[PDB]
Design a protein around this ligand. Structure first.
Ligand SMILES: CO[C@H]1C[C@@H]2CC[C@@H](C)[C@@](O)(O2)C(=O)C(=O)N2CCCC[C@H]2C(=O)O[C@H]([C@H](C)C[C@@H]2CC[C@@H](O)[C@H](OC)C2)CC(=O)[C@H](C)/C=C(\C)[C@@H](O)[C@@H](OC)C(=O)[C@H](C)C[C@H](C)/C=C/C=C/C=C/1C
Length: 125
């Protein structure tokens, strides 16, 4: 295969395609509570339109892994990533914004596609 496809929930709700392999070893995978730094771009599957590319180039996005800060599919995806990994992740609505959707562009029952690059992570004191 060109790329490794990784099913991250058994229900098919979160599926990752590894575009660029990251660094081998457990020490290179972020742990719960760590600050992680990424680039990303998000696209809505239904319309095919990119809704967020603000963090896709020079500006990094930071969040705390597995701390209720982001949609579940992001915690599930990033917890599987190796430092320097670039992936495509397809997130069904159960692991995204569910029925509520988000903002003007993302309705209920949306499938989201993100490209995510894991740049770095750190443990908090
Ligand atoms: C301008 O751009 C927005 C991000 C946009 C919003 C709209 C969506 C389409 C999107 O375009 O991102 C997008 O691409 C997206 O879907 N994202 C952002 C990238 C991570 C994955 C996902 C997400 O979960 O967004 C998140 C989603 C929209 C809302 C959360 C979903 C999970 C749920 O459990 C949370 O309940 C609380 C709410 C937004 C975030 O990643 C930001 C960082 C986090 C929060 C706002 C909350 O965690 C909040 O809870 C108190 C916090 O603790 C924060 C740190 C407090 C500080 C002051 C607020 C910072 C706000 C920053 C906002 C930013 C950069």
């Amino acid at each position: 295969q060109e790329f490794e496809k990784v099913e991250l929930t058994a229900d098919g709700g979160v599926i990752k395609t590894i575009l660029k392999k990251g660094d081998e070893g457990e020490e290179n995978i972020p742990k719960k509570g760590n600050e992680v730094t990424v680039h990303y771009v998000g696209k809505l599957e239904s319309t095919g339109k990119v809704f967020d590319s603000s963090f896709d180039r020079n500006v990094p996005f930071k969040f705390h892994l597995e701390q209720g800060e982001v949609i579940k599919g992001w915690d599930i995806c990033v917890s599987s990533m190796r430092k320097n990994e670039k992936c495509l992740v397809r997130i069904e609505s159960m692991y995204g914004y569910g029925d509520e959707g988000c903002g003007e562009s993302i309705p209920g029952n949306s499938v989201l596609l993100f490209e995510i690059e894991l740049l770095s992570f750190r443990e908090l004191e």
